[PDB]
Amino acid sequence: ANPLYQKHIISINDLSRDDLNLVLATAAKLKANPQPELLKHKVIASCFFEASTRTRLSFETSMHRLGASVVGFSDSANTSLGKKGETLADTISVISTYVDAIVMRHPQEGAARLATEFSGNVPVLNAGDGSNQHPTQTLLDLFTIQETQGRLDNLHVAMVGDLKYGRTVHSLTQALAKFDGNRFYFIAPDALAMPQYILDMLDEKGIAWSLHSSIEEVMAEVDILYMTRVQKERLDPSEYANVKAQFVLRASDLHNAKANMKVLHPLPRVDEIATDVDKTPHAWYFQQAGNGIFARQALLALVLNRDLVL
Amino acid sequence: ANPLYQKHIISINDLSRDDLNLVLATAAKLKANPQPELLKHKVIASCFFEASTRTRLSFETSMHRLGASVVGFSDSANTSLGKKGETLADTISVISTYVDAIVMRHPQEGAARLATEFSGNVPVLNAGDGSNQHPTQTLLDLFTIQETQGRLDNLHVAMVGDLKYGRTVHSLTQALAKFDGNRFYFIAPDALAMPQYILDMLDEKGIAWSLHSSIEEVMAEVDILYMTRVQKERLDPSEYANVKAQFVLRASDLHNAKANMKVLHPLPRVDEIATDVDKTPHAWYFQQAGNGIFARQALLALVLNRDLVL
Amino acid sequence: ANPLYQKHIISINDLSRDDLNLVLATAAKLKANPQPELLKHKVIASCFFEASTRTRLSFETSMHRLGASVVGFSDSANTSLGKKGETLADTISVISTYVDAIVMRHPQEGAARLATEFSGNVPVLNAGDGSNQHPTQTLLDLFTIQETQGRLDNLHVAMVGDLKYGRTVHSLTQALAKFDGNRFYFIAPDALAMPQYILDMLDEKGIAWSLHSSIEEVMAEVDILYMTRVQKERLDPSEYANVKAQFVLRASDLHNAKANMKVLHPLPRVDEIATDVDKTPHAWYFQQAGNGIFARQALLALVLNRDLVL
Amino acid sequence: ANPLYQKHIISINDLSRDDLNLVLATAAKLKANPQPELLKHKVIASCFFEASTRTRLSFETSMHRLGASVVGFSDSANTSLGKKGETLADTISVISTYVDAIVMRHPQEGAARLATEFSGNVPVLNAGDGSNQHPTQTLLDLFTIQETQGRLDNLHVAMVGDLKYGRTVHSLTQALAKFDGNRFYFIAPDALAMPQYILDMLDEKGIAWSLHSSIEEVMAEVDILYMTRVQKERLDPSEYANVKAQFVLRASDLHNAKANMKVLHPLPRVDEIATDVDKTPHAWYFQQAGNGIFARQALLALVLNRDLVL
Amino acid sequence: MTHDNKLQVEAIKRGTVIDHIPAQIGFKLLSLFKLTETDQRITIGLNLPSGEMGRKDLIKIENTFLSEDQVDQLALYAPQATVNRIDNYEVVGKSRPSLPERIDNVLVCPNSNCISHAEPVSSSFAVRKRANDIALKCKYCEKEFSHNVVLAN
Amino acid sequence: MTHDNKLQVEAIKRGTVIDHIPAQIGFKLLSLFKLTETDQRITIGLNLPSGEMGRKDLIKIENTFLSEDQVDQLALYAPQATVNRIDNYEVVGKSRPSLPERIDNVLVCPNSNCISHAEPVSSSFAVRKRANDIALKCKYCEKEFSHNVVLAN
């Protein structure tokens, strides 16, 4: 069947270079030649035990542009499952009798992998599990990098912000390290630096990386600038405010950038990317959010349909 | 038309032996030969004025496996109708202009029957109304009993737990008493015993029953063991803990059970059924939760479609 | 030094007849001649980790009438304690570092007795610990019986209401069993019966008790009628409401009551004692709550003071 | 008139060596001979706009032990103030219209010093303002060092824990730098390091300090071991838990500690100091909290009283 | 000699031999009374033949005399156990367990609201032989439970 | 059957002898790997005399042959230990533990937000890097920690 057919999609660590290319290949075809009744008669469950409006709506719109039906929930201060009494394991054992696939987001790490041991032959797709994984965000980031740069290797990629805790930057570095020749520049406040394990991995692969202090230091050699929001709660108000003349982005800073350089951000962006950046050609975070539809369509199509010939 | 066509489904007391068999007959056919565009163009409303994720998702998946569309809500600390000002009666009078059928769950008893007087010719299906009725749970319990034992009469059925307040055990005893020759064993903490009215009814029909103190006393003659969760809030912590060596179930206790004996539970099960029971052949509560799809499909098909020939 | 000097008043079961008579003789003298400056310069902590307004306001006015200062908190309204895993052993080891006695209420049973292992030489008086004890409500009840009946022995005491979960009837039955020849009538719905460990203690001491269904059966012989509130969550709405909810006193029922009979109730009374009973000589529930001021002042005097000038 | 007469105690940085010694000599005398009526007829406001139970109960017992009345509120539990945009300048201009001193805690840094611009001649003592100061916790810490070590100079003081965000270690390092020849050992995980502005102040004053990773490296030389709680939100769960969470003291670590060494902790301690340390002579955290009563009584005496009879 | 019995067993010179431990309680007792946190010689035997009273277990702990109080706590577990001290190669005393006054430390309050659950406290239950069972009353919550309800939890 | 004694107790009739357990690891291995949940006769020697380690523990489980990977579960706790397999009073096999690639069940993820805490799943860790020193990665949360940290709670 296709290699991912009826497979669980829990961690980037579990998908090979080739699995990532198969998804990106499919998603470029679903973008080009849409197939609206592909999952006709499927019911997907959207179990968001942790609310996330933006990720929830992108998944559900993905389920619906391929014709699937949707049942599910979100839970900020509401609706009963998991309770305290009800285990996750029994929620899943019950729900995997109703549906054909489960997309779930949960606050404790590995909640998705636990689900896998209780869903029977029902595939579960991880939409976030605490501070561990978020594969469908890495899948759309790579689609946007491939779609803008034309390739996924020999890229000069800069990552900026909270590198210690952005789960998306941890994932995107493992993923871009399955391809060849990428150079990484990590511009972070040293209180929020890339953890030694990403770095120790990068060294065994022989991947080149460097740590910088301002985007201004690398603006010129860079192809992707991946901005991350810096999280004030893990900072002191006064620490947050005293870093240099910051690590926020304004169009003045872009006068230097290459013609094909794009700025990516998983969103929300509160203040690290100013409104004037939005009008330059380098701004690509909204387009990045729309490619989420095509990456998540692709993963759903490959998981639920055996042989997909589009 | 079919006998239940366009009928309100409010209480088990209102459905004859024959109506219960017609539902169970249909539901075994919808299980075998699915019919996905049967309610094409119907909009069902899922008004859960009292949240219940597990019952809500089973109904909505039922609506969707027969092709229906769904609008509705759930209300723990949220979304405005009923308010205090807005009567239930006006919520229903308004909603019965929009939809073709109403499934509703509400915290006060008889909320469903009140709905009936305001919905015009729109059928309302009760998904729970306080401590009164929950017909679609009794409908799937009987489907699971019929499907495993091959029959609905001449059964040795044991019910365990909070018999005073499990609404499901009150309903299941009225329902199994429309069929012939059933023997009932009621194992409950005497503070939580079957109320005299179920018992007084059972006696007029001449149905045999007995009250026991431990499952160990009847394990051997029994066909269905219907476990109920005992509710700690109506107990003292210390009362709850001092009952015998309890009324919880473990596989050790099952070494005795007949080959075709199954353990049913409406769920959630917090601690009265231990994890080792789940791996024995006698465990049937997850299968029971999946048959909810087929019982609720059946009721919806018969209510909204005149003559159903499947 | 008096026997209670620097004792912890944690359970009724720990006070002997003599300890109960001493406290009741001291309350009688402070009621007759005030000692407004007896605890001058003492600082007492009033820790109500669970809020109970009625009991707080009386315990602190009692402290204020003997001249002491009060510091303290009411909570279950998140006044920042238990914040970042502080244990109760550690809270009491810091509060006893600067107050002269701790008065505390707490939701878990056992908590005042644990405070005792950490407080050093500062006495701990218990104002309620979960469903376990409340000595100070029993001391004021006893004082009110003594003062209106002239004795604590040879009484005909009827206990009406929820006897199964009412923490105060259980303690008063154990205190009155300290004394001679009292006779008990228990009038409770079947679901709220006086527990067997109380009944067994009474039998073992040769004390006479009996069950009745109507206060009419017993009014004539009764000296103290201690009513309790049923909380309607202990039953269900229709149970409460049913033929069960007539454990309620009206003026017409006191027709044949002895001239000495008194009606006592820990409070809040919501509807078990009708409002027309208040205008009778027999209504002594408010006067019972005024007597809480001298039972608690006497305990505070005997505990902090080694010799009293009577 | 004494130097502190009618001063505002807002920052440690404002008190000179002489002011710190005066307060510590007055605490020593009130600890030895009480003055229970010294602030008789004074009324003090205890305004905790942010709740802090431990500090409130001690500040008010201190007011009660010198004979003053207390009025006031604990909040962040919506006790109706700041209601309809009332500014803090306006709240203090009304509270100073009738109390003799204001004691206040507030979530924003700077707030006690602003109260000072509005209070007139009523002194403002700060009980904590955001992450800025807390003089009264430093005064009780200093008092406890003096009283157990006999001096405030030539000490070997180790500071263990979260040194980056712990408001109290930052103030005590600045107070001890007022004094002579103290030596500092800082033992903190890399993420919770003592900030550079503290380190730079120490270097500029020629005071000796050093970083260590294990308390074992330094136990032998240490006179005061001031432990702090790490709050696990400052790190992530796995960071905390990792090889980082061994900044925790057990009894076995104190084996080689000098006979004079003391373990001090502002509290709540949750698990950084194991419970078996309490039975050692070196555990002085509770005695440190009892010393908060005399450091605060001395500040209230010196501020409200122009001449003291020592 | 050989009717196997022992097969040249570890005649200890001085110490405590707990014998006739009813089977499977053998390991329980090691755990609960932390008998292995000692540096002296222990030799344990589990599921030994009790040609007389069941199948059994037996702990031999050298140069250790576990007495009076210590012996009586074992009543709830191995009521049928004879402790035997040895001072110079044979039995100096042979003591049976009797139910004690109180059982401390080892036992958990059944009551989930009891404060003992979350705190730095050690359990104490007062033991009462209520002629059929033993009722154990918790020091803290003062709730009384069948020894059977307490011994699982 | 033959001579026993206790300074180095002797001969079981077929079964396993885990000899040269460090010291105080014996009871851990009994608890953790629940070797006691057998009706077979087990003999255990705690704090015994020996050549190089000086004092050591030993466990003899008759009629059970625990092997190949059971022996490896022991490597984290008793790496230098030998597992003699005995048939008919002769050691027909001597194994030593080697580091496994998976240690199931016995460990606890130190990450408090891991889902494994609350649920009917067994713990599982991928193991790596021999004797310069061992990292364990949770199956579920995929956090990697130093073995010494998992081995404390």
Ligand SMILES: Nc1ccn([C@@H]2O[C@H](COP(=O)(O)OP(=O)(O)OP(=O)(O)O)[C@@H](O)[C@H]2O)c(=O)n1
């Ligand atoms: N130097 C010795 C002497 C005796 N024992 C032990 O002490 C126990 C005491 O039993 P004993 O009085 O010698 O004969 P029994 O009849 O077995 O005792 P009981 O009546 O309890 O069965 C025996 O199990 C034996 O192993 C020992 O280990 N070392």
Ligand SMILES: Nc1ccn([C@@H]2O[C@H](COP(=O)(O)OP(=O)(O)OP(=O)(O)O)[C@@H](O)[C@H]2O)c(=O)n1
């Ligand atoms: N039927 C037998 C035979 C031997 N042993 C045990 O087998 C273990 C080791 O086997 P062996 O090679 O016979 O003695 P060693 O040479 O000491 O083995 P090693 O050098 O590996 O320790 C010894 O502890 C011995 O008690 C046993 O209990 N039962």
Ligand SMILES: [Zn+2]
């Ligand atoms: Zn208890």
Ligand SMILES: [Zn+2]
């Ligand atoms: Zn984990």
